[PDB]
Amino acid sequence: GLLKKTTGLVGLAVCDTPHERLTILYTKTLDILKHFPKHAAYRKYTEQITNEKLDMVKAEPDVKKLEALLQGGEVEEVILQAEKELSLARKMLKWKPWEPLVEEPPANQWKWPI
Amino acid sequence: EMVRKCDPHIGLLHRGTEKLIEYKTYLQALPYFDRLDYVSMMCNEQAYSIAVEKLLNIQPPPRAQWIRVLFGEITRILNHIMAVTTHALDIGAMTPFFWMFEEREKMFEFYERVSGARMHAAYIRPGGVHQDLPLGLLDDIYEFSKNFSLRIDEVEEMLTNNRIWRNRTVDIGVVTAEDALNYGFSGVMLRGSGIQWDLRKTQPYDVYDQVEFDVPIGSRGDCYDRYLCRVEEMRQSLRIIEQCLNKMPPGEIKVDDAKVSPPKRAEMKTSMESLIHHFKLYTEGYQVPPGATYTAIEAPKGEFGVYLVSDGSSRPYRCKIKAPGFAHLAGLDKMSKGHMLADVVAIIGTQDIVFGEIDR
Amino acid sequence: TYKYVNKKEQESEVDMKSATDNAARILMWTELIRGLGMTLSYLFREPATINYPFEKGPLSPRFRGEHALRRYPSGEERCIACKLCEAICPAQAITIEAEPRADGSRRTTRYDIDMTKCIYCGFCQEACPVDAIVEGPNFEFSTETHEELLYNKEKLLNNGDKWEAEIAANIQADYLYR
Amino acid sequence: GVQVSPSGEKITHTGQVYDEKDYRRVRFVDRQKEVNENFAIDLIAQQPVNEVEHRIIACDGGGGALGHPKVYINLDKETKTGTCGYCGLQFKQH
Amino acid sequence: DMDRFGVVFRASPRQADVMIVAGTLTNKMAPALRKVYDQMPEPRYVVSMGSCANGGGYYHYSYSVVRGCDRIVPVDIYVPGCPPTAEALLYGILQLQRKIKREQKLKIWYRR
Amino acid sequence: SKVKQDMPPPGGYGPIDYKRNLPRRGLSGYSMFAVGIGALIFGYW
Amino acid sequence: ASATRVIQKLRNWASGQDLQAKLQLRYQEIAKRTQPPPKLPVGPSHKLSNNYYCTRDGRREVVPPSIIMSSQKALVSEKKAVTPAPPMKRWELSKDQPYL
Amino acid sequence: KRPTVRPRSDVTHKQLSAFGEYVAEILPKYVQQVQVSCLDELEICIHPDGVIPTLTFLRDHTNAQFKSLADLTAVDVPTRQNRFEIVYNLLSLRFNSRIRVKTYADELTPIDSIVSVHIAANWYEREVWDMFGVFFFNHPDLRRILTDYGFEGHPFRKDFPLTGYVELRYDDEVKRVVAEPVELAQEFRKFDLNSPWEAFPAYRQPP
Amino acid sequence: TSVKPIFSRDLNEAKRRVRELYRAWYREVPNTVHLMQLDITVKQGRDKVREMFMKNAHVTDPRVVDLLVIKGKMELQETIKVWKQRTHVMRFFHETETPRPKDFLSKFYMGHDP
Amino acid sequence: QLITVDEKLDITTLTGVPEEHIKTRKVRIFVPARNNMQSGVNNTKKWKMEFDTRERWENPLMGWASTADPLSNMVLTFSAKEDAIAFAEKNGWSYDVEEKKVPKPKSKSYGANFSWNKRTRVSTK
Amino acid sequence: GSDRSRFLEGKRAVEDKNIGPLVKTIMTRCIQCTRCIRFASEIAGVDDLGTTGRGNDMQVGTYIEKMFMSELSGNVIDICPVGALTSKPYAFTARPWETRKTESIDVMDAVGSNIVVSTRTGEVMRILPRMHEDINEEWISDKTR
Ligand code: SF4
Ligand code: SF4
Ligand code: SF4
Ligand code: SF4
Ligand code: SF4
Ligand SMILES: [Zn+2]
């Protein structure tokens, strides 16, 4: 029944309707994660995280138990993480990090001391 | 009288401390840190002391840690007193600045009694503490502490519920929580927005893990909420002093490791090895193993961090100083949007800025 | 553990009395006349000010001020030209050019300190293994020309044939801590 | 024990004085060249040579921690008298 | 208290008699300090305060510190220390007051 | 002799006030309007 | 202690809170300037026996930074998702003055 | 037991070491030589061309929420051909961990900016340029932040003398502050303090 | 050989930037001399601008030239606005330093310099 | 992309050192000699780089040693000779190199001190 | 080495020998390493320096009051690790960390022995030897030093 009329942080709305924004964003990340090459580690590890956080969103409908169970702060903080992570997947698709190393370093570049 | 663009041209106090350190031994460079944030004096050299301790892989004795926490809280009261007052001096309330400087003078006697200088006590060496507390100085600290919470209330009466102060401070310098991290803010600026962060309660470095206290958090991001965070931190720091006074374990003040800390004057003048170590520690200086560290402590301004690189020598290789004010002042452009010239004046103080640390 | 500083606990509870309390507060400046009350109290208090020339503020035996070259009770200079007070000085303020004294002893021929370079850090007195150089309580030696702050061995022994009545008592009262 | 040079200037305990023809004497015109009149060569000689019973005698400044580092002298020589290296005191036996 | 000696702080150089150069003077600031010193109506005095202002102090050998404000403004009294005790600066101010106490400016005017 | 080191006395010190203590003072809230209006009505007469 | 007890009442009432027990200026509560001689305790490592420096020489216990996935050599890079550390516990309200 | 030696909480060494490998195989195109020190702090070395992808990744990724840029330093090492080793210290506020990201540079090899990812870099990002002469691409403003308006130099480079090449003084002939070559009254006294003995055998470098 | 470029495909392209920066200064000398009360006349001010360019006319590395141009624009930005005062602008003219001699005999007479 | 540049690397104009310290100055690349008073060899192993010494004169006022050059105090350490050479050429200073002087391994035998017919016989102990 | 002393007794002292105007023998600080004895009797060929007594009393030096003066006699200063016997002209004049080491060569003889001219603020303080296995095999004469 409660709606946390004020969120803890400033600049964040109250987001009166959770469990729908989270399901939409986590589902979107999986679809974009499906366009990655299969061997790329980002596809493997990010699926294992989004799916884990997708089950928990469907598991408990109460928000107060979701924030505690889903250890990511308040629901709003968790949602802004899905958006940012969703942005990362798009940027990952273009940078193509999974390719092998380019231009291994010169002879001594991490030799400390001198 | 509306500011469309701020371009803080720091550099008027760029002494260039980081380069002068590289030619100085570790003990020689200690007073440089008392002069970076020159209103929280001995809470700077704690950052240096912790960094050198980490590389040297030594830890200070139990008594030294409590002195470093007890005096690390008097710096917090000293620095917050100025922040509350010099902030109010620019706004116009001159009277509180004169009241609370009758308390800074009292506390500067403690530095002048543990060290010999009112302000720049080169007292917290890496190997613990330089010299033990004189007899009865704890009694003077206690007699100060009792009267203090009355002093903070007297200021709290003057400029906490006034129309003039609330209107000059509320709704000003609102910084969103998302932007506070992206702009690299730290300290009270983070806590004013609402973000829960304090290195004394998340990355403890001293006996701070055995001492109880509360971290004030603000609802809105305005200069008013972070004013209350500064005033409320004085209350909580004044609560740590009660605990440090009530448990100050007996023991030594510097690590019993004559290769890093100097030996006593008495042993220097009767034993040979002690004289050799006294002779070498003050000519070449102890050698720290090669390595790099970034240690951060909750200085009153915020996250004061030092990045020491080292090689197998007695003088460091690179000593970058993360002054908390560098990020805050860089963000001054965003704070003052659609705010008048007087508001900018009220936003310089609310960041609690000294340009010794920024320019360094 | 955190602590909310400007967060309202419970709201939407106001009656005529509570409403009229706020009206009286806003409409008669109650919380501004409250600030005046504190200043009025301070007028009726004893000022903390002290006549500086005639009563001088407190200090401590460890205070660090003007330098001084000490001597043994016999009269012999303490400094032995070991030159590790200029090794630790983090401003290169000290210079020594010692040579043998022609009676065999190791003594200095130059001990000039530049008080404009010195930062009154106290490292030189805790490095000296004979307490040859100290820092007496003399904080009042301001001059009218830059040159008088460039101390030389003759000045530093004068400050040290002057403040020994004080320097000895200070060292005698804090050497146990050292 | 201060002696005045022929030019009228005062010689310090380090033996320095400016020649009559040196221009650096100007700084003392209308002022004075302070020199410490308590020399160190003369004062240490006026002390009596202590006589002890052992052939090895310690020396410190006298106050312990307020003196100089603990040193040990050898007093087997009879033609000369053993001298402490830090303070200029002297010791003999017999 | 400095109001005891009728000493009051004023922001404008046009209404300031003495200038307390307190703190390290850097190259970036050196042009500004001389400008401000010029604005003070004569007679004006300068009271260099601390090691950084007297000479270079702790930063004598840095690349961006003018070794003492005496290179930029003519100093009347030097107050040594780092920082000088509040009494040490007050002794400097009083010792500056005794400087004005012996000017002899009108006495020489009769001799000109 | 025994070690003397500037320690707190046995049982520690007394507690130190550390919380906000702002006294509540002033007239009731209706009395101060009553005085003001009373002064205002007596004045006209 | 020279307020005449009528001004003591005026300043006490105007301030709103009793302050004659909490004065700023110090009268006779301060420790005497001169203090008796101390004897600071001698810390550990003065045992005089079984105290070889090779046991508590922390400066020599530092070793070069352990290396994983070195490009120069051929180090090898079902795995579970990893985090730099377990997530930070959410703080709890203070119980003395939760709201101010 | 050993009051001198620091307590060693070996738990946080395993956690960091696991994460370093996780970052290594989730971003292979740039990651080089991840390492963990005695003091339990992770250190990732990145090809300079991968600064944006690595910093953008370590901020947005759910398992690595490094949103706070602690500082952006730079270490000058004339020994190595790529002198300037730019360093990024990052902080999480979620997992309570600190991670260092390192790249190399050169006086003729600029690096891509980061103000897009971390706005905190902006002022730090010039400070490197003003002090080391490491040009940075795509920065908005990019002007000297610390040094005077007329330094033709880069003070923190190891080839820059400590006293500098110029001093300021006041001249009446021209009635303004002038600049002249530096002539110190007392030369800086370089103390040759290095001891000739192997202090640390664990860092020996065979010939 | 095999060095990445910075705002320059080849020297000729980077020479255009230098010619673009020169046109920015030549149009600017007459505005600084008036905006800030300089004692020089515009004719001799432009001479110093040209002189500061011939000081660096012997360089041929494309990367170096771009960095020289980048610094010049910064030097110009601080002068377009009055960030750098009369003290800084007149620093280029060297109106106080004694002209150091070139003849070996003059060098031999004064100092030990080569 | 990449660029073709055969000209030797040259950054003398970027560092902004005055011309008076570019042509005239001379640089010495050497491995510092062991202080013969001590028998340790840690000061070696690192190629250094000083600059040609210049005039130092007594200050007229105090007798301090005052100098007119900024480069005298600067010493830079390098791992190998080749890296030091690149730095010197890269900054335009003239350089001269003194080759490493490593001691020649010697045959010390305690038994030679006591020999029946050789001249190595030590007359004491 | 250990960082503190377990000694709680009275040390020894030794009669100091005046063995010439170059070297200043303070034999209270000899560690009886027999370097000077070997160098004297294997390089300089002076064979007039040796031990004396036994136990702690193993004093090192010339039994009689004799002049240890030879072309290679100043090199005993270098060889002795402790300051038991050091040069007289250099006595107290300066300290190592103040001095700047510069490379030079001897010109007092035709062999061109290498040299380390240590200067402290624009003046020559001492003339140390350098290692060079072709000339000046770590030794330099008295005339040059
Ligand atoms: S007090 Fe410090 S700065 Fe001053 S001379 Fe002594 S060591 Fe040097
Ligand atoms: S004053 Fe003390 S430390 Fe300095 S040279 Fe003399 S004896 Fe040595
Ligand atoms: S207190 Fe010392 S360091 Fe600070 S400005 Fe003054 S002289 Fe300089
Ligand atoms: S070389 Fe020195 S320490 Fe060794 S025996 Fe000779 S005098 Fe003694
Ligand atoms: S310096 Fe060396 S030889 Fe001299 S007294 Fe000390 S330990 Fe002995
Ligand atoms: Zn003695």
Side-chain angles (χ1 to χ4, degrees), chain G residues 15-98:
Chain G
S15 179
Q17 52 205 320
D18 183 8
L19 58 93
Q20 271 284 115
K22 290 192 177 309
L23 291 183
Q24 293 134 19
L25 295 174
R26 305 136 294 152
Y27 282 71
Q28 273 304 350
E29 65 183 1
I30 301 299
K32 293 182 183 293
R33 312 310 286 143
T34 191
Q35 295 285 333
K39 174 132 91 173
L40 282 71
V42 74
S45 308
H46 286 77
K47 285 183 291 233
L48 201 66
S49 80
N50 188 359
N51 202 7
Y52 276 80
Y53 191 62
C54 79
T55 66
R56 77 280 191 191
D57 186 0
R59 193 168 68 183
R60 301 281 223 291
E61 311 295 30
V62 181
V63 304
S66 186
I67 193 157
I68 300 93
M69 201 285 307
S70 170
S71 77
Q72 286 205 3
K73 291 176 223 301
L75 285 77
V76 168
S77 76
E78 195 79 350
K79 275 302 316 179
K80 274 45 178 163
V82 173
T83 61
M88 182 179 72
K89 186 194 171 292
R90 282 191 43 268
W91 298 356
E92 176 181 358
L93 269 191
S94 172
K95 294 152 191 333
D96 281 329
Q97 278 280 69

Side-chain angles (χ1 to χ4, degrees), chain J residues 6 30 41-42 58 76 89 95:
Chain J
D6 182 61
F30 70 100
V41 292
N42 220 29
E58 269 149 28
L76 300 101
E89 293 179 353
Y95 67 90

Side-chain angles (χ1 to χ4, degrees), chain C residues 16-17 20-21 23-24 27-28 30 34, chain F residues 20 22-25 28-30 32-33:
Chain C
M16 294 299 291
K17 184 152 175 283
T20 305
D21 283 4
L27 191 62
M28 293 154 94
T30 64
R34 197 189 177 76
Chain F
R20 174 182 260 152
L22 297 175
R24 188 174 69 76
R25 179 56 178 58
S28 180
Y30 280 159
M32 64 192 289
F33 284 101

Side-chain angles (χ1 to χ4, degrees), chain B residues 272 275-276 279, chain D residues 86, chain K residues 28-31 80-84 86 95:
Chain B
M272 179 47 172
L275 183 66
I276 284 171
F279 193 89
Chain D
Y86 288 80
Chain K
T28 311
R29 59 190 78 152
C30 170
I31 52 168
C80 177
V82 305
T86 63
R95 269 217 186 287

Side-chain angles (χ1 to χ4, degrees), chain J residues 28 30 34 36-37 73 98, chain K residues 78 100 103 129 131 138:
Chain J
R28 182 171 95 242
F30 70 100
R34 152 172 87 74
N36 264 297
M37 298 299 247
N73 294 309
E98 311 196 300
Chain K
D78 271 18
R100 307 169 143 91
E103 297 156 321
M131 179 153 301
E138 205 181 77

Side-chain angles (χ1 to χ4, degrees), chain C:
Chain C
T1 54
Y2 45 91
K3 203 173 86 77
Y4 288 109
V5 299
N6 191 2
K7 178 166 162 68
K8 301 173 278 181
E9 312 95 321
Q10 290 95 340
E11 317 81 17
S12 68
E13 164 45 57
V14 287
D15 50 351
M16 294 299 291
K17 184 152 175 283
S18 179
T20 305
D21 283 4
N22 301 12
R25 160 181 84 152
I26 297 169
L27 191 62
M28 293 154 94
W29 313 335
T30 64
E31 65 183 1
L32 285 178
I33 306 294
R34 197 189 177 76
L36 291 203
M38 191 84 49
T39 48
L40 190 139
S41 68
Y42 265 78
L43 190 141
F44 300 108
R45 299 190 187 178
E46 66 275 16
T49 301
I50 62 177
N51 301 321
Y52 154 69
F54 298 84
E55 57 265 16
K56 304 177 80 180
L59 297 178
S60 182
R62 311 192 190 177
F63 185 83
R64 294 179 293 177
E66 201 179 346
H67 291 234
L69 270 178
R70 285 192 69 201
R71 324 163 82 97
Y72 291 111
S74 67
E76 187 48 356
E77 305 162 44
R78 265 170 182 284
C79 178
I80 50 181
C82 80
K83 278 190 310 296
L84 63 84
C85 57
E86 66 182 1
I88 194 67
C89 180
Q92 314 218 323
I94 307 143
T95 74
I96 296 100
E97 275 208 43
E99 293 87 5
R101 201 168 57 179
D103 63 358
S105 179
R106 189 176 186 198
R107 254 51 171 181
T108 46
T109 60
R110 173 220 289 290
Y111 200 92
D112 303 57
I113 290 173
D114 188 349
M115 303 291 264
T116 61
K117 272 191 243 170
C118 171
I119 54 156
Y120 303 80
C121 82
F123 289 7
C124 48
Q125 67 168 347
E126 66 182 5
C128 187
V130 293
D131 310 340
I133 192 171
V134 300
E135 284 206 2
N138 203 8
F139 59 78
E140 65 183 1
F141 55 112
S142 57
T143 60
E144 271 164 288
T145 317
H146 191 176
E147 295 294 329
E148 293 82 3
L149 291 169
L150 280 69
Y151 280 23
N152 68 337
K153 189 191 172 82
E154 312 306 310
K155 185 76 190 292
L156 280 180
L157 276 171
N158 274 17
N159 296 327
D161 310 339
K162 185 163 100 167
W163 295 100
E164 279 179 349
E166 209 288 337
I167 285 158
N170 281 8
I171 298 169
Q172 173 54 53
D174 64 357
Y175 79 102
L176 294 171
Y177 304 118
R178 295 190 214 294

Side-chain angles (χ1 to χ4, degrees), chain J residues 30-114:
Chain J
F30 70 100
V31 188
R34 152 172 87 74
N35 195 357
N36 264 297
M37 298 299 247
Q38 288 169 303
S39 59
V41 292
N42 220 29
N43 277 337
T44 72
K45 317 200 199 312
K46 299 292 191 75
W47 289 88
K48 288 230 175 295
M49 193 167 108
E50 309 174 15
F51 283 68
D52 64 323
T53 317
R54 296 268 164 137
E55 65 183 1
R56 278 203 206 77
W57 65 95
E58 269 149 28
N59 210 51
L61 195 153
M62 295 299 290
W64 297 331
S66 82
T67 191
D69 78 5
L71 279 165
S72 82
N73 294 309
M74 201 165 58
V75 301
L76 300 101
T77 180
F78 298 84
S79 276
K81 149 162 68 183
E82 314 311 331
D83 284 328
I85 297 287
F87 200 80
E89 293 179 353
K90 181 162 76 66
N91 286 304
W93 297 308
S94 299
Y95 67 90
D96 72 347
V97 193
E98 311 196 300
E99 296 284 4
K100 179 72 145 289
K101 290 281 152 263
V102 71
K104 190 263 178 184
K106 283 161 280 299
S107 66
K108 297 292 183 184
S109 67
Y110 190 83
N113 289 2
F114 305 104

